């Protein structure tokens, strides 16, 4: 792919997301989703492998079904209301269909089956784009339509997402699949507070995006897609694995790291609305994510796995390409807790 | 070089010319290939890369003086000659390290050819390295699993780079090579068995020469013919290998290849594949000790240009 074409396609994806986040007309939001899919499909297959083609096909099929369902919901709302504006949805069946479509786009269980496969198939950079930027538009649309959403359906999907994202990751030795399942769990966390407070969903989205960017950029720096490949990194670049350990701890939600604040505020907001059982179950189920995070940390940094002789050659050379935003991403992901009260800016 | 440069219009095809070629002079041990390679590089005005050794990466990095064996290579060719079947696994460590060195050298030669347009002459290459591995396996020096690991590494890595346009094989009969080894007088080399050299030759002729001939043309010269370097250069000058990859390659593939070659770590990424063979697997404690020793080496603690010990200055503003 010529770099000019790549820049154009990435800009097209971002422009589709911007159209979703800037349009007051349902048709234009659906157009933005369609542009996002069109641009994204070639991006996922920038490196041509049979796995890349399989992942692109699966993603295309799932997102196309989601888009068709969303358009049907829009048409039903138009039939029963005559309004194209993004606002309260005046038909319950349309609201249910729209929630299903947006959850499928976000990968919320029971529509999560595609996320790990797609993430594993694509490259780490395409994975970063898929798991950070693509989440923005469906969450924006859900936030705009939060009032119409039936809390039971969204909460059921969120709890299932948390549970499944925790369970699947325990069985994974591939870093990309681990990231996909953790993304499922964190998305389940974000959508849990959507009925109650949208600003909490925005805050969680920002913290999750920072952490996922840091993790994916660290993996790209280490060029590791499996736990064993990451295990060798201590011999070559120890600092990378140490920062990975810190970022993993933040992802688990451990205090005092910045990963704690989103869970903290989500629990607070749910409790204010008399939700006690749901926050307790969500917090407890988050421990599994912590478990596989800790296993990855043990492999990467806390314990020194056996290396290979040919690494001696790699010692001499230095990393050519620099990711400028990585240090700030790490710092934000890990050391932003003392600054939570600033959650009224995005407010 | 970068994607921004390619967007601006930095194109490899324009710099490349007829001179722009990769010439690999291959042969058996003490086949005289080095002399012909040097003469070809001089006559055709192409940069000559001496055959990759244990310490080529040392030559390309830092001071350029060879580092201690522990820090770089952990393998000895003399040990292989004296004790081919050592339980240490030195044979396959040497073979894998040599393949890594030749992969790095090929990456550097391609970088030179694509950055400056000048042709490169190489003494053997990653494509010919399997000859020694097959001889070792046939003679029993290395196990089958080591051969499988070598195959995996070569399959993952070698595919990315473009093969050489011209392959020059200098053929010397094995008994004459034995007499040559005796005349040279290196004590370790003298121990080389005749069967090992014969298997080297068998690998070359049976596999390397046919496979290379499929892609392009191979110039096979006897020792007497090889001595006439001018005739070899003329033969090269009148070759027409329209078939083969390089005519197919366009600016996009050249951009990908140049980006790959510039990043040496990316070039060597799969040399460290996590296959836990006893020969090439280093324990955690020894790895930590050796890495600490490497870090303490002068000029290696920090990124190049930031090591104050070796005389770097203005680090605070650098």
């Amino acid at each position: 792919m010529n770099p000019i074409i790549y820049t154009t396609l990435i800009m097209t994806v971002m422009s589709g997301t911007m159209l979703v986040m800037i349009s007051s007309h349902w048709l234009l939001i659906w157009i933005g989703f369609e542009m996002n899919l069109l641009a994204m499909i070639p991006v996922l297959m920038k490196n041509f492998n049979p796995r890349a083609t399989e992942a692109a096909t699966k993603y295309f099929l799932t997102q196309a079904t989601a888009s068709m369902m969303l358009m049907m919901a829009i048409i039903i709302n138009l039939l029963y209301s005559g309004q194209w504006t993004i606002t309260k949805m005046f038909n319950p069946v349309a609201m249910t269909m729209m929630t299903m479509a947006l959850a499928m786009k976000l990968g919320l269980s029971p529509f999560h089956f595609w996320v790990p496969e797609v993430t594993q198939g694509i490259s780490l950079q395409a994975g970063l784009l898929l798991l950070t930027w693509q989440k923005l538009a469906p969450l924006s649309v859900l936030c705009q339509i939060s009032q119409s959403i039936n809390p039971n359906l969204m909460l059921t999907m969120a709890m299932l997402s948390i549970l499944i994202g925790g369970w699947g990751g325990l069985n994974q030795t591939q870093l990309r699949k681990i990231m996909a399942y953790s993304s499922i769990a964190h998305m389940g966390w974000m959508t849990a507070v959507l009925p109650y407070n949208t600003t909490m969903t925005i805050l969680n989205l920002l913290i999750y995006i920072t952490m996922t960017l840091a993790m994916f950029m660290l993996l790209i720096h280490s060029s590791a897609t499996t736990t064993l490949s990451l295990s060798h990194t201590w011999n070559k670049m120890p600092v990378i694995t140490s920062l990975m350990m810190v970022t993993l701890l933040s992802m688990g939600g451990l205090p005092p790291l910045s990963g704690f604040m989103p869970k903290w505020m989500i629990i607070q907001e749910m409790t204010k609305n008399e939700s006690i059982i749901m926050p307790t179950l969500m917090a407890m189920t988050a421990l599994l994510n912590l478990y596989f995070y800790m296993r990855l940390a043990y492999s990467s940094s806390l314990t020194m796995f056996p290396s290979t002789n040919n690494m001696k050659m790699k010692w001499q050379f230095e990393h050519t390409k620099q990711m400028k935003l990585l240090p700030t991403m790490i710092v934000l992901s890990t050391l932003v807790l003392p600054m939570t009260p600033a959650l009224s800016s995005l407010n | 070089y970068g994607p921004l440069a390619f967007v601006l219009g930095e194109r490899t095809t324009r710099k490349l010319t007829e001179t722009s070629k990769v010439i690999t002079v291959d042969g058996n041990i003490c086949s005289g290939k080095g002399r012909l390679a040097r003469e070809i590089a001089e006559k055709l005005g192409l940069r000559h890369f001496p055959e990759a050794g244990i310490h080529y990466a040392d030559s390309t990095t830092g001071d350029g003086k060879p580092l201690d064996v522990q820090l770089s290579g952990n393998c000895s060719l003399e040990k292989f000659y004296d004790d081919p079947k050592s339980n240490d696994g030195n044979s396959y460590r040497l073979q894998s390290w040599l393949y890594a060195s030749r992969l790095l050298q090929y990456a550097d030669a391609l970088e030179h050819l694509l950055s400056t347009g000048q042709g490169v002459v190489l003494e053997r290459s990653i494509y010919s390295d399997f000859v020694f591995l097959e001889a070792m396996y046939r003679q029993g020096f290395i196990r089958k699993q080591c051969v499988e690991h070598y195959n995996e590494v070569k399959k993952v890595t070698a595919c990315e780079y473009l093969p050489p346009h011209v392959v020059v094989y200098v053929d010397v009969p094995v008994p004459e090579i034995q007499s040559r080894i005796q005349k040279k007088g290196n004590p370790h080399e003298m121990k080389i068995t005749a069967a090992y050299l014969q298997d080297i030759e068998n690998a070359y002729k049976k596999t390397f020469l046919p496979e290379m001939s499929e892609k392009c043309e191979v110039l096979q010269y006897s020792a007497r013919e090889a001595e006439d370097a001018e005739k070899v250069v003329e033969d090269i000058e009148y070759l027409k290998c329209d078939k083969g990859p390089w005519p197919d390659q366009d600016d996009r593939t050249f951009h990908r290849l140049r980006m790959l070659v510039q990043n040496k770590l990316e070039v060597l990424n799969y040399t460290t594949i996590p296959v836990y063979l006893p020969e090439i697997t280093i324990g955690a404690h020894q790895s930590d000790r050796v890495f600490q020793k490497f870090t303490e080496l002068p000029g290696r603690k920090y990124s190049p240009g930031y090591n104050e010990d070796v005389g770097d200055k203005w680090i605070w503003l650098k």
Binding site: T227, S231, S299, M304, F305, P306 | P274, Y276, A284, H285
Partner: peptide, 14 residues
């Protein structure tokens, strides 16, 4: 004695 560090068998399980 030295602190135990993962062996090849320990690594292979992952």
């Amino acid at each position: 004695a030295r602190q135990w560090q993962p062996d090849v068998e320990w690594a292979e399980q992952f």
